[PDB]
Nucleic acid binder design. Structure first.
Ligand code: KIR
Ligand code: GDP
Ligand code: ZN
Lengths: 385, 208, 99, 83, 60
RNA sequence: AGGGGCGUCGUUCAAUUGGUAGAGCACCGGUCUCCAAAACCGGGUGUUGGGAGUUCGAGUCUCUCCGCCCCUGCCA
RNA sequence: UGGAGAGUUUGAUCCUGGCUCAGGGUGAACGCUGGCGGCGUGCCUAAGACAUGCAAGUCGUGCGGGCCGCGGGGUUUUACUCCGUGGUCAGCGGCGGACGGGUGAGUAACGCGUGGGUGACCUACCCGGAAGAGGGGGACAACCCGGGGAAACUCGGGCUAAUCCCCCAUGUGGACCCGCCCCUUGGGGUGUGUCCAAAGGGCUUUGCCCGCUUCCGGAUGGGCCCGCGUCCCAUCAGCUAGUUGGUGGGGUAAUGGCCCACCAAGGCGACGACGGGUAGCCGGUCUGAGAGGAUGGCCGGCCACAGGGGCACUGAGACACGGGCCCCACUCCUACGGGAGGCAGCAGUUAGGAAUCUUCCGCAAUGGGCGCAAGCCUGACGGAGCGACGCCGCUUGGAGGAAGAAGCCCUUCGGGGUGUAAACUCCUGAACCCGGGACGAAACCCCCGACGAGGGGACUGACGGUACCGGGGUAAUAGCGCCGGCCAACUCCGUGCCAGCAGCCGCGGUAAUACGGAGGGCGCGAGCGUUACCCGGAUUCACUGGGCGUAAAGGG
């Protein structure tokens, strides 16, 4: 009454971006209900899976829209690629622009644009004016815009056919065939990164559930190494002192997994751990590895106006919000003697006094935001405290 | 665990020069030999008349530091001494002596008590054949204490077994300097044990 | 989901029915007999009563009247009858009762 | 019915039984009717087993089914041996 | 009562009470354990720490 | 995780006329005193919750954080 | 074989008297700190609610079949599938699911403790003795077929087997009525009448093994009754109608108003009735010189309970934890007419809480149920896991080594202390690496002897490649409390009735062994402190062992 889970194809995390009211949140409930015909057993971000015939997928569909930045910004990192959704009717709007910029701020290599809402206002230029301004803004943002697998089709329609009867093979609807175009032109172009199973386990915590009868489960994509039932771990970051327990369950998309490794959004059931004892931001690492820290230094690079950043500079005693992993903390800033007035465009090395103990570590990278705008990036140097 | 730290410090504080080092703390500098006055930034001033308490505490810490024992261990022995028929003063000392790390010392083998422990604890010692690594082991009447085989060659067992040339043991313990044995003939006695300690004063410490 | 204790219940009902019936009988016969013991039917009284006394020890054979719960039912019968006949009757047919 | 089994005494990894005439239904280490001996499975002691003569035989002469591994000891103590 | 010198307890902090009155405060009949919940330890406290919360500082 | 509120000397309360921050106690020094109280002299003692944003300047108008109250969120 | 006191009312005293402290203890919790092992021990709160899995089954030597693999085709083929056949799925029949395991809600009561009574009774399987096991009939499942249903299941028709059911007989005997004798509450004998038994199954077959029937007795386990003992409030004083007794019935294994008719008016209470509160009781446990006081967690005995409540059925036994019915509350499924379900079983979740564990390994051992047996089932149990929660053992090094480094802190500028401590020098070698490696296990069983006694043989170990043993082998953890007095341990700075301490007395208002830090010391040590609660001290409810002229206390 659980259903096991075996691996055969290489795993890969994805997600969908775009503008609120366009397509994304709907083509996801389209791509999933499609690869469920020729494959057995298939406000808040819903992580829904769908497997093809070449690779296993995760897919993080962020609700999008403003206000939901902090919740969007997270999953952005967890994905190897993003399906930039654009509507035929409208076009490149603030969200479609905002999501792409933030899509760059948070790593994320390669982009696969999909033209949805095609089944609206037929126009020679329209369908070929959108495919233009896309690469115009994508490249205005240093993306491979001039060589991005842009597909075309209507999701709203493509799905209504599958709801009549589950099974609907290749090109038997023409519309549910354009879903096989992007779903095909996706396992292509966007490759697979280096998943090192050699580094001491460590996975950030996104959401934390309390699965009845079993205990507290901490979801999140593993960042390195591996974990199976019986392995001890540590809850580093936030809370009085770093907890230590044992993993007694590892599952891949509600179906019993065996051994998770870097690259899979796998949920882990932690041995006797109240649900208040675990929260966002914390990391599950191999015992002894990594520790909780407040003060640190970093080769922070303060952006400039022409790239969204500030344009007035801050002083020693500035309180911005840093995003190390799936979280966001705030901190005071007191840099070395002099070196005052760190206006836009600097590689200064100041010191931060976060109010919440986060899993720091020399080498680990972060970012800075303040006033709803990426003020800068960086990477920890010498961990003071 | 059994203290471990500046020991001639006690040699002093108790005012009755102790033998926790065996050699030096037996030579012209047991520390006492240069400072018969308690340690500390003070240790040498108008010692206020000791309270009836102080007196008994000190007369107890003395007798216990002599054996290195811990308070838990020490107090247990005392309690055991009581319930047993016969003067608790004697008996206590008796049992206190039947200790192994002690009978190791009360027979040569080790220069000190703190040494006689690391000895038994490291195997080197032996009872009726089979060996023991537990100090707390209480030797009975009729049990010889031999050294180990892999021991009779070590640098230490040498010198220690050397001084045994001539020197004698209490009327309650025999010894074969070569056969490295020695039988626990009988439980010692208040007398035999010429210890700088008034037991009845300690017996009284464990009252109120 | 379930157990073979059920077997034990099915039987439960059967046996229940079995002596549930044997009892009704003895009760009916016992009453019918005494109901004559005062009418004077001394002859057919000791006749029925002699029969009742049968099903009694009879049921006693199994788990019906378990034990001497029968012996009691009996004495209360051939005592209720006897003490009804001497109300002008004299023991005709030599039934259970003995003079 | 009334049996003649073993009741476990002695702490962990130090089993020491008590040969007793308990009641079939009792708990292994519950109230027994009458102890008639003990048994040491590690033999640690030149008396690893001892049993009451006239007694064992008594309870047998009144229907007391001895356990198998129990009977083994009754015998090893020569209870049935009629000479 | 709130021990040590200097606390971080505001109108909605959650503390963990224990027995112990304070002879001068007519109403105070309990003490607030330190280093448990909303109540932090005592800063710098190097002396009696077991009491007052504050963890053993590494001489560093 | 997402809505909405409150937060100003140490405190209880103002400036909804955007023009450095205003009142009573509380308290602080000066005189008296061993030290206080009282008495007479004289005092604004301010993380406008934080930090940034517009502005010639913001308690006020924009954000983003902090703590708290509240209303919904939340089974690998 | 056993008894310690101190601080605090005064300017001072003696007395009275309260408060407080030093001791011991705990299913503990909180703080700081934390290395190993052994034996213990771990929801004290919501008797709150619970996903999932497992906790009770077994017998073909009781019986008939379905079905599959197969002697070899029954007839001659694949016809009657007969039979041989070890299995397997239910069914029928039997024994066990009433014990083992959990909890303490309820209960102040013959519940428990203790000693007794039963001429007022029961007891499956187990022992010993007595006599039997002769005839016959019959049904309902399974199966076949028809039917309704979402499901859970259910209905009709018809086969058939038994150790299932029923009738007659034999009556060793037993039951019952009346009589008699003995005896004395209903027990024992006897006579007439009446009524009552039973099953065959397997072999190695006129005999054994396992059953069956009736009776007497032994065992063990129980029911009922009785004397004495069992908390607080009397600001609770009167209580009672099935009430108290009787006669006759019903009822039960059996006494009894247990229940019911009818008759009588009783029964109970300051020796505390009734009522309210609280509570499971005991062996024991902690404390105490003792007498006492407190307590009832783990272990053992008894009782009560099984979501809340009522009730029967089956049965030797239950008004039944993992059986049944019904009402209610909650969970779940539903094709909305009806369905399934109860962790106070073992693990685990959640809620509440200051707080209490792994969804483990094994039936090897012990014990249990069923079996001729093999053997099967067994979250009882034997073990492992997590938590210093407790106790016990062990470690963090032993020996050297300066009129005594540095740093730090004092200083009457000589010096003193931390300090033999270190550094440093020999040194044994926690760990760990390598090899070896258990006891717990000897019978059921096989064989000679008769499956008797006795003799011999074989399989079997979860914990474990763990304990332990040999060899190799690195110096390798320290903290916490406290230093006015009680009470072991003193000095500098800061501070200035502030900040703070505080068990009691009381410390802080500019020289503070009492605050904070520092150095120094004392206590104990993988621990050390704190809070909570019990006993002690408290002869401060005084039996042991006090008091009342004026301290509280003589009643007008
Ligand atoms: C930023 C939020 C969270 C970041 C989290 C972490 O970031 C990271 O630390 C990351 C590591 C590099 C990081 O530090 N990110 C932190 C930052 C990284 C920044 C990198 C790279 C850049 O280079 C300067 C890069 C985008 C660069 O900018 C250019 C953009 C120009 C934009 C002009 C704006 C235009 C027209 C505009 O209309 C516009 C707008 O849309 C919004 C606001 N206002 C505007 O005016 C161009 O597109 C280039 O490509 C890791 O990825 C971590 O793993 C992480 C994901 C947890
Ligand atoms: N006209 C049209 N509407 C569509 C299409 N796809 C989705 N929609 C509808 O647009 C509305 C918002 O779609 P949704 O996917 O939730 O937008 P997102 O959440 O911003 O991606 C819903 O009614 C969708 O069904 C399309 O292809 N054409
Ligand atoms: Zn010395």
């Amino acid at each position: 009454a659980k259903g096991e889970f075996i691996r055969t194809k290489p795993h890969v995390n994805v997600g969908t971006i775009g503008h609120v009211d366009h397509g994304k949140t709907t083509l996801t409930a389209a791509l999933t209900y499609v690869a469920a015909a020729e494959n057995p057993n298939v406000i808040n971000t819903a992580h829904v899976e769908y497997e093809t015939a070449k690779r296993h997928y995760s897919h993080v569909d962020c609700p999008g829209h403003a206000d939901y930045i902090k919740n969007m910004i997270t999953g952005a990192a967890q994905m190897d690629g993003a399906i930039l959704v654009v509507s035929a009717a409208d076009g490149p709007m603030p969200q479609t622009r905002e999501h792409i910029l933030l899509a760059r701020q948070v790593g994320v290599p390669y982009i696969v644009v999909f033209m949805n809402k095609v089944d609206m206002v037929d126009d020679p230029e329209l369908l070929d004016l959108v495919e233009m301004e896309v690469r115009d803004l994508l490249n205005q943002y240093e993306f491979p815009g001039d060589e991005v697998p842009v597909i075309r089709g209507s999701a709203l329609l493509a799905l209504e056919q599958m709801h009549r009867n589950p099974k609907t093979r290749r090109g038997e609807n023409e519309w549910v065939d354009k879903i096989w175009e992007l779903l095909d032109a996706i396992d292509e172009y966007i490759p697979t990164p280096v998943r090192d199973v050699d580094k001491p386990f460590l996975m950030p915590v996104e959401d934390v559930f309390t699965i009845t009868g079993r205990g507290t489960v901490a979801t999140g994509r593993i960042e390195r190494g591996k974990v199976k039932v019986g392995d001890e771990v540590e809850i580093v970051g936030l809370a009085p002192e770093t907890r230590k327990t044992v993993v007694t369950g590892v599952e891949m998309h509600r179906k019993t997994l065996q051994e998770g490794i870097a690259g899979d959004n796998v949920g882990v059931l932690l041995r006797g751990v109240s649900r208040e004892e675990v929260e966002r931001g914390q990391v599950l690492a191999k015992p002894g590895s990594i520790t909780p820290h407040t003060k640190f230094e970093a080769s922070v690079y303060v952006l400039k106006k022409e790239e969204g950043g500030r344009h007035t500079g801050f002083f020693s005693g500035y309180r911005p919000q840093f995003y190390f992993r799936t979280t966001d903390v705030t901190g005071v800033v007191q840099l070395p003697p002099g070196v005052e007035m760190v206006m836009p465009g600097d590689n200064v090395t100041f010191t931060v006094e976060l109010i919440k103990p986060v899993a720091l570590e020399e080498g680990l990278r972060f970012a800075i935001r303040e006033g709803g705008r990426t003020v800068g990036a960086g990477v920890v140097t010498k961990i003071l405290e | 665990g059994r203290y471990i730290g500046p020991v001639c410090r006690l040699c002093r504080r108790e005012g009755v020069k102790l033998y926790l080092k065996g050699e030096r703390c037996y030579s012209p500098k047991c520390a006492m030999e240069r400072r018969p006055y308690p340690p500390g930034q003070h240790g040498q001033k108008r010692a206020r008349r000791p309270s009836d308490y102080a007196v008994r505490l000190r007369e107890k810490q003395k007798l216990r530091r002599i054996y290195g024992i811990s308070e838990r261990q020490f107090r247990n022995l005392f309690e055991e001494a009581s319930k047993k028929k016969g003067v608790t003063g004697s008996v206590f000392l008796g049992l206190l002596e039947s200790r192994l790390d002690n009978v190791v010392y009360r027979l040569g083998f080790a220069v000190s008590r703190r040494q006689a422990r690391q000895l038994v604890r490291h195997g080197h010692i032996t009872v009726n054949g089979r060996r023991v690594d537990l100090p707390s082991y209480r030797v009975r009447p009729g049990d010889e204490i031999a050294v180990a085989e892999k021991s009779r060659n070590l640098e230490l067992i040498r010198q220690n077994l050397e001084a045994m040339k001539g020197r004698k043991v209490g009327p309650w313990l025999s010894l074969d300097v070569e056969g490295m044995k020695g039988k626990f003939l009988r439980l010692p006695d208040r007398e035999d044990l010429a210890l700088p300690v008034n037991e009845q004063l300690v017996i009284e410490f464990y009252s109120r | 989901r379930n157990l073979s204790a059920l077997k034990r219940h099915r039987q439960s009902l059967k046996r229940r029915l079995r002596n549930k019936a044997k009892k009704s009988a003895i009760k009916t016969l016992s009453k019918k007999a005494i109901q004559l013991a005062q009418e004077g039917k001394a002859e057919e009284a000791l006749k029925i009563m002699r029969k009742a006394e049968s099903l009694i020890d009879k049921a006693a054979k199994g788990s019906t009247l378990h034990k001497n719960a029968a012996a009691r039912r009996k004495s209360r019968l051939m005592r209720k009858v006897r003490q009804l006949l001497e109300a002008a009757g004299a023991p005709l047919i030599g039934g259970g009762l003995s003079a | 019915m009334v049996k003649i089994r073993l009741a476990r005494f002695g702490s962990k990894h130090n089993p020491h039984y008590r040969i007793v005439v308990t009641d079939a239904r009792r708990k292994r280490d519950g109230k027994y009717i009458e102890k008639i001996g003990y048994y040491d499975p590690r033999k640690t002691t030149p008396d690893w087993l001892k049993v009451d003569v006239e007694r064992a035989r008594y309870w047998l002469s009144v229907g007391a089914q001895p356990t198998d591994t129990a009977r083994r000891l009754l015998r090893q103590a020569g209870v049935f041996r009629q000479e | 009562y709130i021990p040590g010198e200097g606390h971080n307890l505001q109108e909605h902090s959650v503390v963990l009470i224990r027995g112990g009155r304070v002879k001068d405060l007519p109403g105070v009949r309990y003490h607030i354990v330190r280093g448990v919940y909303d109540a932090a330890g005592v800063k710098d406290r190097k002396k009696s720490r077991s009491k007052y919360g504050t963890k053993k500082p590494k001489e560093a």
